[PDB]
Design a protein around this motif. Sequence first.
Motif, PDB file in Angstrom:
ATOM      1  N   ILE A   1       0.718  -1.224  -0.142  1.00  0.00           N
ATOM      2  CA  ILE A   1      -0.054   0.060   0.103  1.00  0.00           C
ATOM      3  C   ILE A   1       0.768   1.242   0.025  1.00  0.00           C
ATOM      4  O   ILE A   1       0.663   2.297  -0.629  1.00  0.00           O
ATOM      5  CB  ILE A   1      -0.913  -0.051   1.207  1.00  0.00           C
ATOM      6  N   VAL A   2       1.957   1.145   0.843  1.00  0.00           N
ATOM      7  CA  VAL A   2       2.977   2.417   1.117  1.00  0.00           C
ATOM      8  C   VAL A   2       3.579   2.734  -0.299  1.00  0.00           C
ATOM      9  O   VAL A   2       3.696   3.783  -0.478  1.00  0.00           O
ATOM     10  CB  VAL A   2       3.608   2.234   2.249  1.00  0.00           C
TER      11      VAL A   2
ATOM     12  N   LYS B   1       2.683   1.663  -3.105  1.00  0.00           N
ATOM     13  CA  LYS B   1       1.804   2.339  -4.076  1.00  0.00           C
ATOM     14  C   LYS B   1       1.635   3.709  -3.893  1.00  0.00           C
ATOM     15  O   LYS B   1       1.295   4.548  -5.146  1.00  0.00           O
ATOM     16  CB  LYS B   1       0.435   1.176  -4.079  1.00  0.00           C
ATOM     17  N   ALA B   2       1.278   4.013  -2.872  1.00  0.00           N
ATOM     18  CA  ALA B   2       1.130   5.619  -2.352  1.00  0.00           C
ATOM     19  C   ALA B   2       2.665   6.381  -2.814  1.00  0.00           C
ATOM     20  O   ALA B   2       2.280   7.598  -3.154  1.00  0.00           O
ATOM     21  CB  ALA B   2       0.860   5.799  -1.202  1.00  0.00           C
ATOM     22  N   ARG B   3       3.665   5.834  -2.880  1.00  0.00           N
ATOM     23  CA  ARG B   3       4.899   6.496  -3.304  1.00  0.00           C
ATOM     24  C   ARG B   3       4.839   6.608  -4.766  1.00  0.00           C
ATOM     25  O   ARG B   3       5.487   7.747  -5.248  1.00  0.00           O
ATOM     26  CB  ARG B   3       6.227   5.797  -2.598  1.00  0.00           C
TER      27      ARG B   3
ATOM     28  N   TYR C   1       2.281   6.546  -6.640  1.00  0.00           N
ATOM     29  CA  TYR C   1       1.209   7.753  -6.747  1.00  0.00           C
ATOM     30  C   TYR C   1       1.832   8.959  -6.547  1.00  0.00           C
ATOM     31  O   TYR C   1       1.684   9.928  -7.399  1.00  0.00           O
ATOM     32  CB  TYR C   1       0.204   7.517  -5.723  1.00  0.00           C
ATOM     33  N   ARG C   2       2.706   9.217  -5.577  1.00  0.00           N
ATOM     34  CA  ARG C   2       3.518  10.534  -5.186  1.00  0.00           C
ATOM     35  C   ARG C   2       4.247  10.943  -6.309  1.00  0.00           C
ATOM     36  O   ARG C   2       4.233  12.133  -6.939  1.00  0.00           O
ATOM     37  CB  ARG C   2       4.371  10.384  -4.065  1.00  0.00           C
TER      38      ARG C   2
ATOM     39  N   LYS D   1       2.105  11.723  -9.559  1.00  0.00           N
ATOM     40  CA  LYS D   1       1.419  13.099  -9.451  1.00  0.00           C
ATOM     41  C   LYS D   1       2.638  14.271  -9.366  1.00  0.00           C
ATOM     42  O   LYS D   1       2.211  15.574  -9.711  1.00  0.00           O
ATOM     43  CB  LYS D   1       0.722  13.337  -7.749  1.00  0.00           C
TER      44      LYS D   1
END
Lengths: 35, 58
Positions: A2-3, A5-7, A9-10, A13
Amino acid sequence: EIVSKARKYRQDKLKQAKTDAAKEIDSYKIQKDKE
Amino acid sequence: GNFKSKLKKAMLSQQITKSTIANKMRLKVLSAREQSLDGIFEETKEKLSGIANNRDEY
Protein backbone atom coordinates in the motif's frame (compact mmCIF):
# COMPACT_ATOMS: atom_id res chain seq x y z
CA GLU A 1 2.56 -2.72 -0.78
CA ILE A 2 0.00 0.00 0.00
CA VAL A 3 2.74 2.43 1.04
CA SER A 4 4.89 1.73 -2.04
CA LYS A 5 1.78 2.25 -4.17
CA ALA A 6 1.22 5.60 -2.46
CA ARG A 7 4.86 6.44 -3.20
CA LYS A 8 4.46 5.59 -6.89
CA TYR A 9 1.32 7.72 -6.76
CA ARG A 10 3.46 10.48 -5.24
CA GLN A 11 6.06 10.28 -8.04
CA ASP A 12 3.37 10.18 -10.75
CA LYS A 13 1.55 13.18 -9.28
CA LEU A 14 4.97 14.83 -9.02
CA LYS A 15 5.54 14.53 -12.76
CA GLN A 16 1.90 15.44 -13.51
CA ALA A 17 2.24 18.65 -11.51
CA LYS A 18 5.39 19.60 -13.43
CA THR A 19 3.60 19.06 -16.74
CA ASP A 20 0.33 20.78 -15.78
CA ALA A 21 2.44 23.71 -14.62
CA ALA A 22 4.78 23.64 -17.62
CA LYS A 23 1.82 24.07 -19.96
CA GLU A 24 0.59 27.16 -18.13
CA ILE A 25 4.20 28.31 -18.17
CA ASP A 26 4.49 27.91 -21.94
CA SER A 27 1.05 29.48 -22.31
CA TYR A 28 2.21 32.48 -20.29
CA LYS A 29 5.32 32.51 -22.48
CA ILE A 30 3.18 32.24 -25.61
CA GLN A 31 0.91 34.97 -24.24
CA LYS A 32 3.93 37.19 -23.53
CA ASP A 33 5.19 36.57 -27.06
CA LYS A 34 1.74 37.43 -28.43
CA GLU A 35 1.45 40.68 -26.47
CA GLY B 1 11.87 39.58 -17.42
CA ASN B 2 13.33 38.59 -20.78
CA PHE B 3 10.07 39.52 -22.51
CA LYS B 4 10.10 42.87 -20.71
CA SER B 5 13.67 43.49 -21.87
CA LYS B 6 12.81 42.58 -25.46
CA LEU B 7 9.68 44.73 -25.39
CA LYS B 8 11.67 47.63 -23.94
CA LYS B 9 14.19 47.24 -26.74
CA ALA B 10 11.39 47.22 -29.32
CA MET B 11 9.74 50.32 -27.84
CA LEU B 12 13.14 52.00 -27.73
CA SER B 13 13.55 51.13 -31.41
CA GLN B 14 10.13 52.65 -32.07
CA GLN B 15 11.14 55.84 -30.27
CA ILE B 16 14.45 55.90 -32.15
CA THR B 17 12.80 55.40 -35.54
CA LYS B 18 10.26 58.08 -34.61
CA SER B 19 13.03 60.49 -33.58
CA THR B 20 14.87 59.74 -36.83
CA ILE B 21 11.67 60.34 -38.80
CA ALA B 22 11.19 63.62 -36.92
CA ASN B 23 14.79 64.57 -37.72
CA LYS B 24 14.20 63.77 -41.40
CA MET B 25 10.99 65.82 -41.37
CA ARG B 26 12.66 68.82 -39.73
CA LEU B 27 15.54 68.42 -42.18
CA LYS B 28 12.94 68.40 -44.95
CA VAL B 29 11.43 71.63 -43.61
CA LEU B 30 14.87 73.24 -43.48
CA SER B 31 15.67 71.97 -46.99
CA ALA B 32 12.40 73.38 -48.31
CA ARG B 33 12.97 76.74 -46.63
CA GLU B 34 16.53 76.88 -47.96
CA GLN B 35 15.36 75.83 -51.43
CA SER B 36 12.88 78.70 -51.22
CA LEU B 37 15.66 81.06 -50.17
CA ASP B 38 17.84 79.81 -53.02
CA GLY B 39 14.86 80.21 -55.34
CA ILE B 40 14.39 83.79 -54.20
CA PHE B 41 18.11 84.24 -54.79
CA GLU B 42 17.55 82.79 -58.27
CA GLU B 43 14.81 85.31 -59.05
CA THR B 44 16.86 88.19 -57.64
CA LYS B 45 19.89 87.01 -59.63
CA GLU B 46 17.68 86.85 -62.71
CA LYS B 47 16.65 90.43 -61.97
CA LEU B 48 20.30 91.49 -61.60
CA SER B 49 21.35 89.69 -64.79
CA GLY B 50 18.44 91.34 -66.58
CA ILE B 51 19.35 94.73 -65.14
CA ALA B 52 22.95 94.27 -66.28
CA ASN B 53 21.81 93.77 -69.89
CA ASN B 54 21.12 97.48 -70.38
CA ARG B 55 24.23 99.35 -71.53
CA ASP B 56 22.62 102.79 -71.25
CA GLU B 57 21.66 102.07 -67.64
CA TYR B 58 24.87 100.24 -66.71
